[PDB]
Design a protein around this ligand. Structure first.
Ligand SMILES: O=C(CP(=O)(O)O)O[C@@H]1[C@@H](OP(=O)(O)O)[C@H](OP(=O)(O)O)[C@H](OP(=O)(O)O)[C@H](OP(=O)(O)O)[C@H]1OP(=O)(O)O
Ligand SMILES: Nc1ncnc2c1ncn2[C@@H]1O[C@H](COP(=O)(O)OP(=O)(O)NP(=O)(O)O)[C@@H](O)[C@H]1O
Ligand SMILES: [Mg+2]
Ligand SMILES: [Mg+2]
Ligand SMILES: [Mg+2]
Ligand SMILES: [Mg+2]
Length: 325
């Protein structure tokens, strides 16, 4: 019989352009059949009624019932491409940074401010005009303040008096803007945050996309920390700049992929002071608008499936050579 690869995510993701491009290419594998789980089934049907698969590609986004995905995998024991339990941890920036540290991955110096919503003023925070003290640890402005929830994209940067003070408030892109300046110089007074040192870059962030530990595509975009106007080309797509990862960065990608057990994994790099710092790990994420990535990603994922399962299905398989870039 055919090896069945099941795709389990919100419809917004399962029906996206990159997903469709990749799934058509995986379907080209002679012994692989692709089954996309309907969102109505995922949300409304008990896991006992979900389609069967031999390999599961499943990932959380807003609205996704991760508890059900975990129960399904426990019930059916498929080969899992992106580990489901780690997807709880990826939602919490504190857990992300903790894992990166444990792996010896360079990251910004940071401190966690845990605030009790009932006792908001009892937290370990002291504010000056040009610095904060978080659990005793000092951060001179400029510094970055991130919500502990990785799904909350309201990241603020606080400027020193020497630069005019105030703050840059970042957010999920709304049309032509990714951030705005505010005259507010004082930090947020409700919620829990990670405070971290601001790393000076050349004005771009590097986005890295892994497909297994030995392949990573990188590209750069204008930092939303700069002025907040999104750069678009003549076709209306956000401008991306070419990146080739160095040997240190290729190792970072290998480590992130393995540490979080996410075969397909997106993360952000800051090129600063002659090193590269990870500032965010997003989990399952495809490159957009690259034909070559569609080809490479589908080939790599199909090969992973065949490598793992071809012996069980008595299918002959000799492992092929793959690009790393
Ligand atoms: O903002 C946009 C609109 P686009 O820029 O015109 O495409 O697209 C973003 C998606 O928002 P929505 O598509 O509107 O839901 C967002 O999904 P979410 O987190 O569920 O909100 C992520 O997509 P993914 O799930 O990781 O693949 C972002 O990629 P990231 O995680 O590396 O930051 C996308 O940003 P990039 O496309 O500019 O790289
Ligand atoms: N320590 C830092 N130093 C300098 N710039 C930073 C730092 N942390 C974050 N940034 C910038 O702020 C942006 C948003 O921060 P990030 O930690 O990626 O938040 P996010 O809400 O998880 N974004 P994403 O998940 O990629 O949509 C990054 O792309 C960087 O440009
Ligand atoms: Mg096929
Ligand atoms: Mg995501
Ligand atoms: Mg990011
Ligand atoms: Mg993120």
């Amino acid at each position: 019989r055919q090896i069945v690869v099941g795709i389990c995510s919100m419809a917004k993701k399962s029906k996206s352009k990159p997903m469709k491009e990749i799934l058509e290419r995986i379907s080209l594998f002679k012994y692989i059949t692709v089954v996309v789980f309907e969102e109505e089934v995922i949300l409304n049907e008990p896991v006992e009624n979900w389609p069967l698969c031999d390999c599961l590609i499943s990932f959380h986004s807003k609205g996704f019932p991760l508890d059900k995905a975990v129960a399904y995998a426990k019930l059916r024991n498929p080969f899992v491409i992106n580990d489901l339990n780690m997807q709880y941890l990826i939602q919490d920036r504190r857990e992300v940074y903790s894992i990166l540290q444990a792996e010896g991955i360079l990251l910004p110096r940071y401190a966690i401010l845990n605030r009790d919503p009932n006792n908001p003023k009892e937290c370990n925070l002291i504010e000056g005009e040009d610095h904060v003290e978080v659990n005793g640890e000092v951060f001179q402005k400029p510094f970055v303040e991130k919500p502990v929830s990785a799904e909350d994209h309201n990241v603020y940067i606080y400027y020193p008096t020497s630069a005019g003070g105030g703050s840059q408030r970042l957010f999920r892109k709304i049309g032509s803007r990714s951030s705005v300046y505010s005259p507010e110089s004082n930090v947020r007074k409700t919620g829990s945050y990670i405070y971290e040192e601001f790393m000076p870059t050349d004005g771009t962030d590097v986005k890295v996309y892994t497909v297994g530990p030995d392949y990573a595509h990188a590209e750069a975009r204008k930092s939303p920390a700069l002025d907040g106007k999104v750069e678009r080309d003549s076709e209306g797509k956000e401008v991306r700049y070419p990146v080739i990862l160095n040997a240190r960065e290729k190792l970072i990608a290998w480590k992130v992929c393995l540490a979080f057990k996410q075969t397909v994994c997106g993360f952000d790099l800051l090129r600063a002071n002659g090193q590269s710092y990870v500032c965010d790990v997003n989990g399952f994420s495809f490159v957009k608008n690259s034909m070559k990535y569609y080809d490479d990603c589908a080939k790599i994922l199909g090969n992973i499936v065949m490598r793992e399962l071809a012996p069980q299905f008595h299918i002959p398989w000799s492992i092929p050579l793959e690009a790393e870039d």
